[PDB]
Amino acid sequence: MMTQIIHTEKAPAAIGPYVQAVDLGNLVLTSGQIPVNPATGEVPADIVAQARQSLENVKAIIEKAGLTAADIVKTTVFVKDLNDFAAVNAEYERFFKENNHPNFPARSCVEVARLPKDVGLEIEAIAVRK
Amino acid sequence: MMTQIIHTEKAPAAIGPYVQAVDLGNLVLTSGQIPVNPATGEVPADIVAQARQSLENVKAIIEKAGLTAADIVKTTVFVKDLNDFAAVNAEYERFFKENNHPNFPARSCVEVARLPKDVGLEIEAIAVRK
Amino acid sequence: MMTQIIHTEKAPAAIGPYVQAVDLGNLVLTSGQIPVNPATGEVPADIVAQARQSLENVKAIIEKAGLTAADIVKTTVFVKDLNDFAAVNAEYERFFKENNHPNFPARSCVEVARLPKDVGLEIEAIAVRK
Numbered sequence: 519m520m521t522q523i524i525h526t527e528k529a530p531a532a533i534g535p536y537v538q539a540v541d542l543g544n545l546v547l548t549s550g551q552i553p554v555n556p557a558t559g560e561v562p563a564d565i566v567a568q569a570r571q572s573l574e575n576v577k578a579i580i581e582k583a584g585l586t587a588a589d590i591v592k593t594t595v596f597v598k599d600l601n602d603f604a605a606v607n608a609e610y611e612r613f614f615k616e617n618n619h620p621n622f623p624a625r626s627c628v629e630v631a632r633l634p635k636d637v638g639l640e641i642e643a644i645a646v647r648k
Numbered sequence: 649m650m651t652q653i654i655h656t657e658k659a660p661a662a663i664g665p666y667v668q669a670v671d672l673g674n675l676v677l678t679s680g681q682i683p684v685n686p687a688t689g690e691v692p693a694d695i696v697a698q699a700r701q702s703l704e705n706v707k708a709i710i711e712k713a714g715l716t717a718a719d720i721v722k723t724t725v726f727v728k729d730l731n732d733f734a735a736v737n738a739e740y741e742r743f744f745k746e747n748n749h750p751n752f753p754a755r756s757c758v759e760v761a762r763l764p765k766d767v768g769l770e771i772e773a774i775a776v777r778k
Numbered sequence: 779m780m781t782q783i784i785h786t787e788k789a790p791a792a793i794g795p796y797v798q799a800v801d802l803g804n805l806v807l808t809s810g811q812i813p814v815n816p817a818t819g820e821v822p823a824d825i826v827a828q829a830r831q832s833l834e835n836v837k838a839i840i841e842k843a844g845l846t847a848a849d850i851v852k853t854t855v856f857v858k859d860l861n862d863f864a865a866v867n868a869e870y871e872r873f874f875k876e877n878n879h880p881n882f883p884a885r886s887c888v889e890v891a892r893l894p895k896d897v898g899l900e901i902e903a904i905a906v907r908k
Contacts, residue, residue, distance in 0.1 A: 591670050591672060592652070592670055600762050600763075600764065607664060611664050611665030621653065621667070622667040624666055624677055624679040625664075625665070625666035625680055626772050628761075628763050628764065629760060629761040630760060631761045646652070648651055
């Protein structure tokens with residue numbers, strides 16, 4: 519039996535009051551990831567670049583656990599500019615099907631006032647593996 | 649056995665990286681719905697009208713699956729004006745009990761900066777059926 | 779068998795379209811709590827004081843049910859000032875381990891535009907008890 523707690527060597531890492539992710543068993547969940555630039559360690563200005571890195575981090579954790587984005591049941595993403603979603607949404611959906619994730623997980627994205635680390639976007643989705 | 653994926657002919661419909669809703673089986677979940685005006689296809693200015701339509705869409709999906717709002721375990725709603733919640737909250741609670749939903753599902757509403765489609769409100773709640 | 783619904787005599791109490799909390803059984807969930815000052819009934823200006831009270835309310839409900847913060851699988855908290863998180867995060871993590879909550883539940887905090895009751899912060903986390 520297992521419950522939450524998900525270690526990995528790709529995500530932003532956990533060193534505070536939270537872990538990289540949580541594996542409840544059969545139903546996984548990813549914390550509010552962020553485009554922690556691999557060279558700046560924060561959030562690339564390139565809404566597309568930062569948007570792509572954030573997706574890799576969220577998947578890296580779920581992948582290190584033994585799953586895939588395709589399994590993602592639901593997904594949530596906070597944006598600092600709903601006008602930029604045009605590029606993120608176009609690439610967000612184009613990658614899922616390009617990764618074999620046509621299931622299309624639930625969505626819950628909204629324009630928040632701000633985000634941790636001044637990040638221009640956050641990612642938090644759920645995944646299953648029945 | 650089932651997992652996520654919920655089709656319907658009432659909700660805003662899914663044509664991107666997400667589905668109308670997701671049925672994990674026994675525990676359903678609705679995506680961030682929106683008052684997609686049946687005549688404008690976006691969000692009626694009438695905070696009350698748009699607030700009512702949004703509730704119907706969220707219920708239409710759960711209803712098309714085989715459940716009811718009364719079963720809703722938790723609920724989340726983003727507002728663009730916490731001052732308007734006075735009318736939404738008054739009608740939100742008056743409809744639940746009027747629909748046989750006295751259980752009172754969890755709440756998680758907050759004043760967000762913006763919302764998809766420039767909608768003045770979003771709805772995302774969970775439902776059970778043990 | 780049980781499903782949602784969690785009564786208590788410590789939390790902000792439920793008198794509208796939502797209950798104090800919801801106990802799905804084995805997997806609990808707390809609604810968007812708030813620092814409802816015990817003397818003002820709203821939200822203390824002391825970001826630290828209000829931040830501490832909010833934590834007690836969220837735990838009071840889960841405690842009245844038969845669990846602890848340590849069991850918390852995931853956690854979400856809306857802030858009105860990401861600059862204040864420096865004090866909340868420092869005390870948030872210092873209390874978990876001080877309460878025996880080193881598990882570190884998932885995180886999902888963001889700077890929202892506003893919050894119910896003009897509260898300067900909201901709390902909503904999940905808990906397990908397998």
